[PDB]
Design a protein around this ligand. Structure first.
Ligand SMILES: *[C@@H]1O[C@H](CO[C@@H]2O[C@@H](C)[C@@H](O)[C@@H](O)[C@@H]2O)[C@@H](O[C@@H]2O[C@H](CO)[C@@H](O[C@@H]3O[C@H](CO)[C@@H](O)[C@H](O)[C@@H]3O)[C@H](O)[C@H]2NC(C)=O)[C@H](O)[C@H]1NC(C)=O
Ligand SMILES: *[C@@H]1O[C@H](CO)[C@@H](O[C@@H]2O[C@H](CO)[C@@H](O[C@@H]3O[C@H](CO)[C@@H](O)[C@H](O)[C@@H]3O)[C@H](O)[C@H]2NC(C)=O)[C@H](O)[C@H]1NC(C)=O
Ligand SMILES: *[C@@H]1O[C@H](CO[C@@H]2O[C@@H](C)[C@@H](O)[C@@H](O)[C@@H]2O)[C@@H](O[C@@H]2O[C@H](CO)[C@@H](O)[C@H](O)[C@H]2NC(C)=O)[C@H](O)[C@H]1NC(C)=O
Ligand SMILES: *[C@@H]1O[C@H](CO)[C@@H](O[C@@H]2O[C@H](CO)[C@@H](O)[C@H](O)[C@H]2NC(C)=O)[C@H](O)[C@H]1NC(C)=O
Ligand SMILES: *[C@@H]1O[C@H](CO)[C@@H](O[C@@H]2O[C@H](CO)[C@@H](O)[C@H](O)[C@H]2NC(C)=O)[C@H](O)[C@H]1NC(C)=O
Ligand SMILES: *[C@@H]1O[C@H](CO)[C@@H](O[C@@H]2O[C@H](CO)[C@@H](O)[C@H](O)[C@H]2NC(C)=O)[C@H](O)[C@H]1NC(C)=O
Ligand SMILES: *[C@@H]1O[C@H](CO)[C@@H](O)[C@H](O)[C@H]1NC(C)=O
Ligand SMILES: *[C@@H]1O[C@H](CO)[C@@H](O)[C@H](O)[C@H]1NC(C)=O
Ligand SMILES: *[C@@H]1O[C@H](CO)[C@@H](O)[C@H](O)[C@H]1NC(C)=O
Length: 644
């Protein structure tokens, strides 16, 4: 004891960057108080058996640790400190060691195989260090081990097959490492195992079929590895499983139907693999299933109708597969289903009547399927909707009757469908809606004025429709819109001056419309705008000087219009302007002597105008093709279509 206290004092004297306020100040009077007052020290029969210095700001190494002087250590917790260096082999000399924790330190080097001498060890914790090399196989000797935690290290090599000899192990945590090679099938001998976390490693090979003997494992995390082969059907024999995660691997073959035998399985993650074949209908017998994610695979065939038996199903992710056939009604029949991601598949037919039958669906994705028909009535009245994506289908019906009031709606995408009718003002009650995208539909009529009352709208895309009417000046109320796309419609009249007020506007496209008369002269107050496309309209008169004050403009397209007069010399204020399309207009005069000042100008078309004179000094005019510069009255000082 006095020798133990002296030995620990000499080790303490090697600590660096220490403070008088350290909790080790109590290490005084070794001859009297070692077993009564010393912080972290506890004794039996006046001999230290417990050294607990966790989170005491100790900075040092174990080189001068008094191994020989503390023979009776049974509990060592030196975690959450600033210990550096290696783990000396003499740590294996503490024959009575039961608990050993060096976690959350700055230790380096390999794990000494002498730890396999600690025959009484029940907990080994070495997490969150920089330990490298292979795990010693002699650790498999420690048959009293209840828990091994080596995660968040730099360990390499295979998991030792001796680990199968640890008949009392309950938890094996080896995640966040660089372990490699095949998983030893001897792990199937770990009959007491409850948690197997080998995720985030570089493990290869097949999942051992002996895993079917692990009847007590409730958590199997092996995701983010490089496992190959197919999921062995023996996995369906791990009856205690409630979480099975094999995602982000290179697994192939079919999903074994034996997974339906996992009556306690609540979480199944199989995504980001190369699984093929059909989804077994026996997967509908996973009665506890809450979170089923087998998205991002190559599964084919139809979704089984037995999915209606998954009464606890909350999240279903089937996106990015090759599933086909009609969507069976049981896929959305769960009363607690809140996420239903089916996009990027080959589903056909119409949506089932069960989609939002409980009024709890929040996330629905159906992008890029072959679906068609009407929106089901339970979807029209699904007030819990937060995101809904129908893009890339053949859905039909009156858009004013197919969609109700969605107060919790945040994002909706109806693009590339066959919706008809007029935009209803009901959308205005989606006070949380930040994006409304309905490109490429058969929407007709005017835009209801309530749409401009959506100050929270960030992105509004009604392009490639048959919308008509004149835009009112109340369009200025969209304070937070940054992407406005109304192009490809039959909107008529003047462009409203109120677009001035859309300060956050970055991307504005009013092209391919019937806008007439002059571009608003006041339109000069869009500091975030980098793209403006007013092409293919009926606009005329001079190009207004206000456009030259939108400094951040990168791309400007005023082509296919009836603008006249001269290109202003104030285009020099568009230093950021890269693309400038002015073709098919009635512009006149000289390209202003000032275009040299503009530098980022690479793609310019000024063809089919009445301009005359010489081309100015910058790339795009040198790099212009015949079509880019043709059709003007008097081109170039030396009448050139080729260089100078
Ligand atoms: C396991 O890791 C050790 C230690 O590596 C050290 O810590 C890591 C977390 C990384 O930050 C490494 O960059 C860092 O070095 C490896 O051993 C170490 O090898 C290096 C060079 O390979 C040794 O540096 C040498 O130091 C001498 C001076 O004594 C110089 O003359 C040399 O030119 C060279 O700079 C370093 O001393 C050594 N550290 C030890 C042995 O504790 C080890 O190779 C690695 N094992 C693996 C990856 O299998
Ligand atoms: C501004 O919006 C208009 C449309 O509103 C864009 O016009 C599009 O321009 C591209 C190329 O300039 C056209 O593609 C061309 O199609 C023809 C016919 O298929 C083909 O022969 C060409 O080789 C080229 O592929 C496209 O058809 C045209 N769209 C329409 C509806 O006319 C314009 O590009 C936009 N401006 C900017 C800067 O993006
Ligand atoms: C293309 O433009 C020319 C230029 O005329 C414009 O006239 C003003 C209205 C103003 O815009 C100026 O910047 C231009 O000079 C048109 O030519 C004129 O045509 C009118 C007939 O309406 C005639 O009275 C004028 O004398 C013409 N002027 C010149 C200089 O020739 C031309 O008609 C326009 N072409 C098209 C297809 O629109
Ligand atoms: C602490 O360690 C010492 C030695 O490692 C133990 O002392 C031995 O005790 C046994 C039986 O009690 C004796 O037969 C030996 O002669 C002792 N050896 C020495 C060098 O004293 C001591 O029992 C241990 N104490 C605890 C609480 O584990
Ligand atoms: C060392 O001391 C710490 C804190 O004084 C102990 O941490 C406790 O550990 C148990 C589990 O063994 C937890 O249930 C407690 O909540 C923890 N408390 C705190 C404050 O962290 C730790 O167990 C001790 N270790 C040894 C070997 O004595
Ligand atoms: C396992 O699957 C992953 C998929 O993430 C593969 O990683 C990709 O490999 C190719 C290049 O060979 C590219 O698609 C990407 O560069 C990789 N990363 C991705 C897609 O995130 C990996 O190659 C596969 N291993 C195999 C087949 O042995
Ligand atoms: C002590 O802390 C300083 C500041 O972080 C650091 O530069 C130094 O390496 C540490 N160790 C010693 C022995 O000074
Ligand atoms: C596991 O223990 C048995 C006991 O005899 C031994 O024969 C076997 O070699 C051990 N496995 C490994 C991989 O060391
Ligand atoms: C492992 O499962 C078997 C199955 O019979 C059971 O008897 C045993 O108690 C379980 N072990 C643990 C540690 O739960």
């Amino acid at each position: 004891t006095v020798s133990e206290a002296n030995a620990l004092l000499k080790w303490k004297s090697t600590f660096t960057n220490q403070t008088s306020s350290s909790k080790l100040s109590s290490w005084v009077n070794p001859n009297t108080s070692f077993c009564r007052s010393w912080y972290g020290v506890s004794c039996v029969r006046n001999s230290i058996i417990r050294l607990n210095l966790t989170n005491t700001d100790i900075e040092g190494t174990f080189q001068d640790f008094p191994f020989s002087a503390l023979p009776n250590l049974s509990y060592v917790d030196l975690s959450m400190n600033r210990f550096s260096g290696t783990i000396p082999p003499q740590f294996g000399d503490f024959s009575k060691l039961i608990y050993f924790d060096l976690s959350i330190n700055q230790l380096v080097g390999e794990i000494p195989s002498e730890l396999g001498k600690l025959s009484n060890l029940e907990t080994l914790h070495l997490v969150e260090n920089k330990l490298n090399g292979s795990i010693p196989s002699e650790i498999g000797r420690l048959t009293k081990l209840h828990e091994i935690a080596l995660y968040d290290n730099l360990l390499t090599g295979p998991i030792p097959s001796s680990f199968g000899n640890l008949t009392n192990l309950a938890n094996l945590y080896l995640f966040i490492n660089s372990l490699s090679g095949p998983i030893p099938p001897e792990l199937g001998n770990l009959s007491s195992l409850a948690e197997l976390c080998l995720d985030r490693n570089k493990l290869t090979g097949q999942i051992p079929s002996s895993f079917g003997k692990l009847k007590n494992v409730t958590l199997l995390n092996m995701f983010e590895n490089n496992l190959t082969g197919e999921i062995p059907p023996e996995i369906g024999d791990m009856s205690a499983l409630d979480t099975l995660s094999l995602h982000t691997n290179n697994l192939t073959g079919s999903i074994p139907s034996s997974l339906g035998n996992l009556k306690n399985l609540a979480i199944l993650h199989l995504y980001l693999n190369k699984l093929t074949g059909s989804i077994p209908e026996e997967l509908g017998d996973m009665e506890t299933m809450i979170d089923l994610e087998i998205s991002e695979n190559k599964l084919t065939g139809p979704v089984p109708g037995s999915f209606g038996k998954l009464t606890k199903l909350e999240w279903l992710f089937l996106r990015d597969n090759h599933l086909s056939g009609p969507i069976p009604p049981g896929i959305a029949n769960s009363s607690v289903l809140t996420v239903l991601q089916l996009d990027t598949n080959n589903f056909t037919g119409v949506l089932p009547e069960t989609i939002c039958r409980s009024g709890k669906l929040e996330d629905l994705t159906l992008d890029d399927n072959l679906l068609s028909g009407p929106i089901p009535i339970s979807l029209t009245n699904c007030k819990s909707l937060i995101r809904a994506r129908f893009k890339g289908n053949s859905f039909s019906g009156d858009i004013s009757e197919s969609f109700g009031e969605y107060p919790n709606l945040n994002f909706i995408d109806l693009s590339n469908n066959k919706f008809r009718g007029q935009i209803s003002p009901k959308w205005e009650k989606s006070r949380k809606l930040v994006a409304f995208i309905a490109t490429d539909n058969n929407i007709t009529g005017p835009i209801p004025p309530e749409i401009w009352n959506m100050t929270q709208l960030n992105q509004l895309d009604l392009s490639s429709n048959n919308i008509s009417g004149e835009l009112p000046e109340t369009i200025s109320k969209l304070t937070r819109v940054s992407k406005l796309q109304l192009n490809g419609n039959q909107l008529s009249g003047r462009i409203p001056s109120g677009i001035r007020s859309l300060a956050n506007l970055e991307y504005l496209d009013l092209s391919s419309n019937r806008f007439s008369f002059q571009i608003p002269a006041t339109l000069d107050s869009l500091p975030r705008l980098y793209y403006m496309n007013l092409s293919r309209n009926d606009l005329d008169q001079n190009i207004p000087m206000g456009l030259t004050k939108l400094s951040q403009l990168q791309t400007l397209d005023l082509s296919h219009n009836n603008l006249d007069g001269e290109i202003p010399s104030q285009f020099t204020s568009l230093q950021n302007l890269e693309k400038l399309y002015l073709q098919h207009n009635n512009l006149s005069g000289p390209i202003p002597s000032s275009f040299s000042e503009m530098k980022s100008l690479t793609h310019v078309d000024v063809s089919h105008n009445n301009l005359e004179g010489p081309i100015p000094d910058n790339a795009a005019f040198k790099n212009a093709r015949p079509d880019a510069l043709e059709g003007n009255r008097d081109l170039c000082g030396s009448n050139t279509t080729q260089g100078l």
